Design a protein. Structure first.
Lengths: 68, 81
C-alpha cells in the first residue's frame, strides 16, 4: 500500500495486473526486448579475480548478432 | 597454456572506463598532442642526429675528393719539357 501510493499514486489491484499479464505474447516479448536490450551499451561491474572478464569492446559486440 | 584466467596475481587495483560512443576519438590535438610530440623530439634529438650529420660530412668529402682525382695535373706536362 505505502510503496504503491508513493510510486503510482494509487493501489493497483491484482485483477488489473492479471489483465495486463494476459495481453503479453511472444510478439510483444520480441518487440519490447528489442526496444531495451538489442544493440545497447551496458554498464558493467566486477569484483574478485576478474582477469578473465572480457574486455569492454568484446562485451559491447555481444549485444548484437551479425546474422540478423 | 598462457590464457586470460591465470596470468599473474594482483590485489587492490581499481580501473574505470567509458564506452567509445560516449567520448571523442580526437579530443585535444593542438592543446595537448603537439607539445607532447615536441618534448618527445627534444628527449631524443642528441642521441640520434649527430651520427647522421657525421655521415653527411663524410659522404660529401669523399665525393669531392674522388671528383678532384679525375682532373689533369698541370705539372704532369709542364715540369720537364
Ligand atoms: C591476405 C593477406 C594476409 C596478411 C595481412 C596482414 C594484416 C592482417 C591484420 C588483420 C588480421 C585479422 C585476423 C582475423 C580476425 C578474426 C576475428 C574473429 O573471428 O572474430 C570472431 C567474432 C567474435 O564473436 P564471438 O565472441 O566468437 O561470438 C561468436 C558468435 O557466434 C557470434 O555470432 P554472430 O551471428 O554475431 O556471427 C556469426 C556469423 C556472422 O556472419 C554472418 O552471419 C555473415 C557476415 C557477413 C556476410 C558474409 C557472408 C559470406 C558468405 C560466403 C561467401 C559468399 C558470398 C556471396 C557470394 C556467393 C557466391 C556463390 O559468422 C559465422 O558464423 C562465420 C561464417 C560467416 C560466413 C558464412 C559462410 C561460411 C563459409 C565460408 C566459405 C565459403 C566458400 C564458398 C563460397 C561460395 C562459392 C564461391 O565472431 C565471429 O564468429 C566472427 C565471424 C567472422 C567471419 C569471417 C568470414 C570471412 C570469410 C568469408 C568468405 C571467404 C570466401 C569467399 C569465396 C568467394 C565467394 C565470395
Amino acid at each position: 500500500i505505502g510503496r504503491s501510493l508513493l510510486t503510482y499514486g494509487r493501489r493497483i489491484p491484482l485483477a488489473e495486473w492479471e489483465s495486463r499479464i494476459a495481453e503479453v505474447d511472444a510478439s510483444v516479448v520480441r518487440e519490447i526486448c528489442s526496444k531495451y536490450i538489442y544493440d545497447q551499451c551496458p554498464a558493467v561491474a566486477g569484483y574478485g579475480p576478474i582477469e578473465q572478464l572480457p574486455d569492454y569492446n568484446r562485451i559491447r559486440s555481444g549485444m548484437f548478432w551479425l546474422r540478423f | 597454456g598462457r590464457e586470460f584466467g591465470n596470468l599473474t596475481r594482483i590485489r587492490h587495483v581499481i580501473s574505470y572506463s567509458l564506452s567509445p560512443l560516449e567520448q571523442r576519438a580526437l579530443p585535444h590535438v593542438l592543446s595537448k598532442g603537439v607539445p607532447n610530440m615536441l618534448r618527445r623530439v627534444r628527449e631524443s634529438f642528441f642521441r640520434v642526429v649527430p651520427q647522421f650529420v657525421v655521415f653527411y660530412l663524410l659522404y660529401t668529402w669523399g665525393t669531392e675528393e674522388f671528383e678532384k682525382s679525375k682532373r689533369k695535373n698541370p705539372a704532369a706536362y709542364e715540369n720537364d719539357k
